[PDB]
């Protein structure tokens, strides 16, 4: 990692909880990562948000 | 009077764990390899690190097909 390649938390949008954490390069991807992922709290697929760790 | 050399890694135990004729089981690693020196045949898989393994109970088999390479198989019983 680096100050640019940062790890962050992935927050499921419909359960208000964070389920994951991955890598992204803020120079190549400064946008907020929003990607599908499974949420056991909702028991179904949900789109996930980029939230600061 | 120093030595800029003197650095090394540890060996990874590369080779054939079960030779042809040995008793194997599902999950028993067959050959630890880097790259494709051996290629999988019947009931033999390949891992991300190129390691091979048997899928069923049977007998190990080594059959060299020349330009296709050496192949490993498992004989059910």
């Amino acid at each position: 990692a680096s100050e640019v390649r940062i790890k962050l938390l992935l927050e499921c949008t419909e359960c208000k909880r964070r389920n994951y954490a991955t890598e992204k390069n803020k120079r190549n991807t400064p946008n907020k990562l929003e990607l599908r992922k499974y949420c056991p709290w909702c028991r179904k697929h949900t789109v996930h948000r980029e939230v600061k760790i | 009077g120093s030595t800029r050399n003197g650095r090394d890694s540890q060996a990874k135990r590369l080779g054939v764990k079960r030779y042809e004729g040995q008793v194997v089981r599902a999950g028993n690693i067959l050959v630890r390899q880097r790259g494709t020196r051996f290629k999988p045949g019947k009931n033999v898989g390949m891992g991300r690190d190129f390691t091979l393994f048997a899928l069923v109970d049977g007998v190990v088999e080594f059959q060299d097909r020349g330009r296709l390479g050496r192949y490993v198989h498992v004989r059910p019983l």
């Binding site: - | 009077g1 120093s2 030595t3």
Partner: protein
């Protein structure tokens, strides 16, 4: 002298001088041959003497040939320093010669000078040698 202007790596390990010669046992170039009879490490400076001191016999004319090369570097630590602290430093490149190897060959000169010129070269080596005429056994290969 004779030494590589480019190599892959700097130093080479010593190895072992066991066994007979790989090849070059048959006269391949000239009318007469000088073949060393003992295994040892030979230096390109001694071989340099074998070239210069031998052209100094004819003073002009003739043709002298070379059958070997110093492809093996030789290293030595500085003086008055202890063991360890890396391998020694190279002071020159040495040649690997095995028993029965035809080291040199002479052509374009008479029999008398073919024996006499290779004689001094025989005395310039730590190992004994022999002068053999290009023989019917040689060209068969």
């Amino acid at each position: 002298m004779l030494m590589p202007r480019r190599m892959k790596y700097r130093k080479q390990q010593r190895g072992r001088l066991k066994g007979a010669t790989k090849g070059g046992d048959y006269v391949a170039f000239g009318d007469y041959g000088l073949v060393a009879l003992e295994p040892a490490w030979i230096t390109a400076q001694q071989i340099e003497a074998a070239r210069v001191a031998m052209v100094r016999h004819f003073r002009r004319g003739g043709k002298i040939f070379i059958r070997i090369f110093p492809d093996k570097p030789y290293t030595k630590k500085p003086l008055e320093v202890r063991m360890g602290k890396g391998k020694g430093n190279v002071e020159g490149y040495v040649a690997v010669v095995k028993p029965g190897r035809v080291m040199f060959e002479v052509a374009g000169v008479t029999e008398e000078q073919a024996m006499e010129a290779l004689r001094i070269a025989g005395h310039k080596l730590p190992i004994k040698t022999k002068i053999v005429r290009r023989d019917a056994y040689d060209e068969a290969q």
